[PDB]
Design a protein around this ligand. Structure first.
Ligand SMILES: [Fe+3]
Length: 51
């Protein structure tokens, strides 16, 4: 699934992950550490919406 950061428009794609910030491809959004934030704007996970 894909999730959009409502603040900046960055799309978190579970298939891509966010390797530069310690999230391997295939990591489900719920499995991402609670302290991870949008890599672009710094918004907390609370500001993401599932597409
Ligand atoms: Fe963002």
């Amino acid at each position: 699934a894909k999730y959009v950061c409502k603040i900046c428009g960055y799309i978190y794609d579970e298939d891509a992950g966010d390797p530069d910030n310690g999230v391997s491809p295939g990591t489900k959004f719920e499995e991402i550490p609670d302290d991870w934030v949008c890599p672009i704007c710094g918004a907390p996970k609370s500001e993401f919406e599932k597409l």
